[PDB]
Amino acid sequence: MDRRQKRLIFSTITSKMNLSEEVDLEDYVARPDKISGADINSICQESGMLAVRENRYIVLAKDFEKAYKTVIK
Amino acid sequence: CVSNIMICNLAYSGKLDELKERILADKSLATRTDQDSRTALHWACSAGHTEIVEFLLQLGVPVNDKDDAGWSPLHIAASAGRDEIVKALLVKGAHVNAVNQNGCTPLHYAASKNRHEIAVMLLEGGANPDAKDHYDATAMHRAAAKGNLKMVHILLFYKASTNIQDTEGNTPLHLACDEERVEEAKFLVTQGASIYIENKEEKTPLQVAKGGLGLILKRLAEGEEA
C-alpha cells in the first residue's frame, strides 16, 4: 500500500493505545513487507495482548517487534 | 504498573525519594533487572525523570546495558525526547552508535521524531550520520520520508550521505518523492541527492515523483551538474 496510508492506519489504531514514549512506529512503517490493513490491525492487537500478558499497561518496542514477526509469516 | 520489579515501577512513576531510600537501603536494587531486562535507569529514562537518572548515574550504575529489545538508555532517552537526560548520559560515556534489535542507533529515532537538539547532541558526540539499520535505512531516510526538512539539513551539516540505499533500493530522495515532500526533495537534489539511482522497482526518484515534481528536480539536478 501507499506509505502514508500505512502510517495513518498505524497511528490511527495506536492513537487509542498506551504506547511508551520511546516507541517509534516509523520502525515498522519503513519496512519492505507488503502487509495489509488487516495485518496492521493484527500487529497492534497482538502488541496490546503481549503488553497485557506481561501485566504492563504501556506498550513497548519489544511488543511491536514480536507482533510484527508473528503476523508477517 | 509497568514492571514486575518494584524499583522499576518507582523509576517510571518518578518517585525519587522512595526510590533513593530503597536503593541506599539495598544498593543491588539500583541494577536489578525486570522481565524486560530493564533497570530503574531504563524506566526513568522512558518516563523522562531527569532527577532519578542523575541520582543513578552518580551512583555509578552501568549506562550502556540494553533491554531484551536491544534498547540502551540512550536509545530510550533520545526517542522519548528527554534532552536533559541524553546530555547527562553522553557525559557518562553512553555509546552513541549502539544499535538495538532492528539495527537502529539513537540518532535514528531522534531524526525520525524530528528532535533537533537531541540530534545535534548525538552528532556532536560522535554519532555516525550514515548508520544503517537492518533494512539499510539511515536517519535521513526516516527524516526525508516524513518531511523533516530542518532535520535533513542538520544531518547534512554532519556530513550525512544522500544516496545510501535501503533494502528496497530507495534513497532519502525516493522516500521524499513518494511522500510528496516537495520542498525537501528540491533541497535534497540541491545538495547532491542523485536523480539517477534506481530502486528495486527499477524506478529513479524521478519516476517515483508525482505531479510534475520530476521535471522540477531534473532541472535542478542538471543545473547543479553544470
Swiss-Prot record, chain A:
The modification N6-acetyllysine is found at K62, K66. It comes from the Eukaryota. Disulfide bonds: none annotated. Transmembrane segments: none annotated. It is found in: Cytoplasm; Nucleus. Belongs to the AAA ATPase family. Component of the 26S proteasome, a multiprotein complex involved in the ATP-dependent degradation of ubiquitinated proteins. This complex plays a key role in the maintenance of protein homeostasis by removing misfolded or damaged proteins, which could impair cellular functions, and by removing proteins whose functions are no longer required. Therefore, the proteasome participates in numerous cellular processes, including cell cycle progression, apoptosis, or DNA damage repair. Component of the 19S proteasome regulatory particle complex. The 26S proteasome consists of a 20S core particle (CP) and two 19S regulatory subunits (RP). The regulatory particle is made of a lid composed of 9 subunits, a base containing 6 ATPases including PSMC4 and few additional components. Interacts with NR1I3. Interacts with PAAF1. Interacts with TRIM5. Interacts with ZFAND1. This is 26S proteasome regulatory subunit 6B. The chain holds residues 337 to 408 of 418 of the full protein.
Curated annotation (Swiss-Prot), chain B:
Induction: Up-regulated by activated HRAS. Keywords: ANK repeat, Apoptosis, Chaperone, Cytoplasm, Nucleus, Repeat. SUPFAM superfamilies: Ankyrin repeat. InterPro entries: Ank_repeat_dom-contain_49, Ankyrin_rpt, Ankyrin_rpt-contain_sf. One of its GO terms (biological process) is negative regulation of release of cytochrome c from mitochondria. Transmembrane segments: none annotated. PROSITE patterns: ANK_REP_REGION (PS50297), ANK_REPEAT (PS50088). ANK repeats lie at residues 1-33, 34-66, 67-99, 100-132, 133-165, 166-198, 199-223. Acts as a chaperone during the assembly of the 26S proteasome, specifically of the PA700/19S regulatory complex (RC). In the initial step of the base subcomplex assembly is part of an intermediate PSMD10:PSMC4:PSMC5:PAAF1 module which probably assembles with a PSMD5:PSMC2:PSMC1:PSMD2 module. Independently of the proteasome, regulates EGF-induced AKT activation through inhibition of the RHOA/ROCK/PTEN pathway, leading to prolonged AKT activation. Plays an important role in RAS-induced tumorigenesis. Acts as an oncoprotein by being involved in negative regulation of tumor suppressors RB1 and p53/TP53. Overexpression is leading to phosphorylation of RB1 and proteasomal degradation of RB1. Regulates CDK4-mediated phosphorylation of RB1 by competing with CDKN2A for binding with CDK4. Facilitates binding of MDM2 to p53/TP53 and the mono- and polyubiquitination of p53/TP53 by MDM2 suggesting a function in targeting the TP53:MDM2 complex to the 26S proteasome. Involved in p53-independent apoptosis. Involved in regulation of NF-kappa-B by retaining it in the cytoplasm. Part of transient complex containing PSMD10, PSMC4, PSMC5 and PAAF1 formed during the assembly of the 26S proteasome. Stays associated throughout the assembly of the PA700/19S RC and is released upon association with the 20S core. Interacts with PSMC4. Interacts with RB1. Interacts with CDK4. Interacts with MDM2. Interacts with RELA. Associates with a CDK4:CCND2 serine/threonine kinase complex. Interacts with ARHGDIA and increases the interaction between ARHGDIA and RHOA, hence promotes ARHGDIA inactivation of RHOA and ROCK. This is 26S proteasome non-ATPase regulatory subunit 10. It comes from Mus musculus (Mouse).
